[PDB]
Amino acid sequence: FYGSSAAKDELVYGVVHIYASFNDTFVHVTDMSGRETFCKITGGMKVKADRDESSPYAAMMAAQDVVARCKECGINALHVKMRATGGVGTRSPGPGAQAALRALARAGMKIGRIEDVTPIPTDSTRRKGSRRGRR
RNA sequence: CAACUCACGGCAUCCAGGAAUGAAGGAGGGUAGUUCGGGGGAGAACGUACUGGUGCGUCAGAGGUGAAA
Secondary structure, eight states, X not given: OOOOSSOSSSOOBOEEEEEEOSSOEEEEEEOSSSSSEEEEEEGGGGOSOSTTSSSHHHHXXXXXXXXXXXXXXXXXXXXXXXXXXXXXXXXXXXXXXXXXXXXXXXXXXXXXXXXXXXXXXXXXXXXXSOTTOOO
């Protein structure tokens, strides 16, 4: 395997970006800089159906097959950053989390310092749609 | 021309006999508190976000919807 030469049985943290939306989930894995990756596995890939990309089953079935790589890279622990659709999109996250997290934690990864990093504008121009909304 | 009790007289002589009703629970104008405030104009900076681009990583899906295209 291609893992660390540092220590044995002493925690090595990665960073995990859990992108939640109403039309997809992603799970992504990086080191600390975010200039280098280890995984990039998306809810969509684990299903065949446009409908069922974002549903909680999909999410979990990504998260599994992420930790199925990360262990081999020597990543024991994780730090987790939760994100929602956009800045002019919704502050509320998708149902692809409360799926994702609850997989990872019971997949034999450790966890610490969960955060919410999502775009919040000081102000924006126009939200897409119209004065009367979608109707 | 001056000197010179007091008078006459001379002096682009002066002030006072309140000589001009009151100061509207009307208006106007002052003086002040470094007063009071998303009031107005000009100039110099600040903030994230949307969008585009560049560099560095990864690799097959991503967008979108009730379901799709």
